[model samples]
Target: MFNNILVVCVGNICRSPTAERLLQRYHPELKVESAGLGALVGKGADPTAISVAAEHQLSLEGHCARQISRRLCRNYDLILTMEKRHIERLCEMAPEMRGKVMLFGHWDNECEIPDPYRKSRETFAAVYTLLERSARQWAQALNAEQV
Candidate 1:
């Protein structure tokens, strides 16, 4: 039922952008975007995130951070967040979003994906896999919905 999907994270630079790029590449026909609740605004994807995405043959080049707003919530069929805290914050900005805002892992019934900012390389790698796993599940689910 979701044709336009938006993924969310705290800083936009790490989790959300990575997930957004991956999701868009996998479903080019869909209108997919991502934003941050507290975006690092104007910052590109984290260097660590970029290299790891490269390992998967994905590129997150030239991604600029964007902060969440009410208009953004209204424009999407689904809004996925990296953590639980994001939903409360987002819905607070636009109560109507209460129905659409959710964890990115929701499609796969997985737990909240943690933010890996200022963490070790091991942590960034770990979070990237989590996004890939969830994004893959979302890809299949979205594909099936289109059929």
Candidate 2:
């Protein structure tokens, strides 16, 4: 059901890209990508986010921020958003996708992943921990589903 997954956040340079790469690393067979609701379009991942990802042996290279749209929403089988408001906005953009949109932390008690853009490297690292854990939970579930 989650063969194609899109991770979203506000800037698309921080949380979304971080989570996108983590999910991709865990499940290379899946098509994982990311975009933002209010993106800094054409921008690459935040420096701090890229560094933190490198610490975990994950790369956010070549990822450019893109804006979310109805067509982008329709392209993904599953849409994982950082916050509840993101899900709300996506549903507003494409009400038909409500069934497919979900919190990136869906398996972590449905928690929300906070953005750490322009924050200290320490803060970025903390956010990375959250994204990594969330991705692992999703990887487990997605793997099970495929089996």
Candidate 3:
């Protein structure tokens, strides 16, 4: 199951895009995409996001920001967001997605992943590290189901 996964954040240009790239690399068989809550719609991944992902050998080269929509919410099997507020917002927009919406750090039960939009390179690096850890946990969860 869970063939279609969507990652969400405030702006599609940063955190979500990075998470999308990580998920795509770690689980190539799955169809993964990213969208924004407010969406800098039509924008490319933030430079900070691209640079940080590159350091980990993950590419955000093809990412273009898209806004989250009710229809898009209905299409995803797993909808992971950068923070708890994102899940709340998604639920408000599409209540049917309630069960499927979860924090990207769900395995850790964390409600927030700090956004590093205009912050320093160090902040982006920190956020990327957190995203990577969460992605690994997600991969492990998937692998467990197969076993």
Candidate 4:
């Protein structure tokens, strides 16, 4: 029942793109992408995010920030958002997707993934751990589901 997953954050540069690449790496057979509730629109991933992702050997290259919309919401089977605030915004964008939208940490702590945009390396490091842990949880579940 789960495929075509879309990860979302406030800017799409930090948390969303980082998680997107991680999710893609874990579930290569599944369709994974990301956007933002308040995207930079055409901006590439944040350098801090890119750096943290590089530490993990994950690449967020060429990922331009895109804003969320109804059409984009409708295309995905599952929408994983960083914060509860995002869930609220997405509900307005695509009301019907309310059921499909969930926290990226759904399988983990169910807490919001804080945005680390333009923040210090310490913040990025913390956010990176949260994203990795969350993605790791999803990875395990997806592998089990496909088996």
Candidate 5:
């Protein structure tokens, strides 16, 4: 039973933040947060990510970037990463967390959600769509488990 989720990506500004906010919106009962493998620590979400999230009525407000740490891996119920490489690196960093880490696109054929940092609005939107759909899938699965 997952109640806390940590969404991870590179830089902590784009994919992970978007997924974190969307997941939080879809599953208000879960405690969702975001972090980065190579984080731009102490920074806010990317402007494009925030704008795209606002368009979907989700907020990335108060999100400050933080680097993924061993302690972080120990804290969450589930750790969702944007790509396989992140999973690899994270598992290497904290081998004990292997079973808890998963793809954000786990329900979508285990697809990897690409990062949309510094790209055009269209790219950001595309990534947003992926996060939206994947977050919904997670919400549905979690809801079913609760029932």
Candidate 6:
């Protein structure tokens, strides 16, 4: 039922971009994009995030930070955030997003995807592992729901 998926985080430069790129690679036919809860607003993905994605043979060089907006909230079939705080904030900004808003790790029923911005490469690696696993699970779930 969800043709378009939107991933969200505090800054579009890290978690959200990672999720967006991974989802796009796994489900090339789906429309996947990301924005920040309080985005860097025009900045590119974090260098560490880009490097970690590169390690996985993914490119995040073209990503630009975008701030979440009410219009954005209304445009997607699903909206997945990295943390509970983002969900709460989104709902406050656009109450209509309540039912559609979910955690990126929602398939695992998890409520958070630890942020790794401004941290060590190891932290970025850890976050990427979490996101990759979650994204794979989501892809499976989406496929199963398909006709």
Better candidate by lDDT, 1 or 5: 5
lDDT score of model 1? 0.83
Candidate 5's residue-wise lDDT over 82-101, tens digit each? Answer: 78888899999889889888
Give each model a TM-score: 0.92, 0.96, 0.95, 0.93, 0.95, 0.95
Candidate 5 yields a Cα-based lDDT of 0.87
Give candidate 2's whole-model lDDT: 0.88
lDDT of 6 by residue, 1-147 (tens): 587988999868999889998888888898988799889999989999999999999998788889989999999988988788888898998899888888867777675878997999999999999999988988888778867
Model 3: colliding residue pairs: none
The lDDT per prediction is 0.83, 0.88, 0.87, 0.86, 0.87, 0.87
Over 4 Å off, model 5: none
Candidate 4 TM-score, true structure as reference: 0.93
| Error in Å for residue 55 of model 1 | 1.4
How well does model 3 score by local distance difference test? 0.87
Query: Lowest summed-lDDT stretch of 10 residues in model 4?
Result: 138-147
For 46-126, candidate 4 gives per-residue lDDT tens digits of 999888888888999999899988999998999888788889889988999999888867886678877887779989989
Give the runs in model 2 whose Cα sits over 4 Å from its true position: none
Compose the digit string of candidate 3's lDDT tens values, residues 46-66: 998888888877889978899
What is the number of backbone collisions in each predicted candidate, taken in the order shown? 0, 0, 0, 0, 0, 0
- True lDDT of residue 134, candidate 5: 88
40-90 per-residue lDDT for model 2 (tens digits):
999988988988888878889999999988999999999988788888899
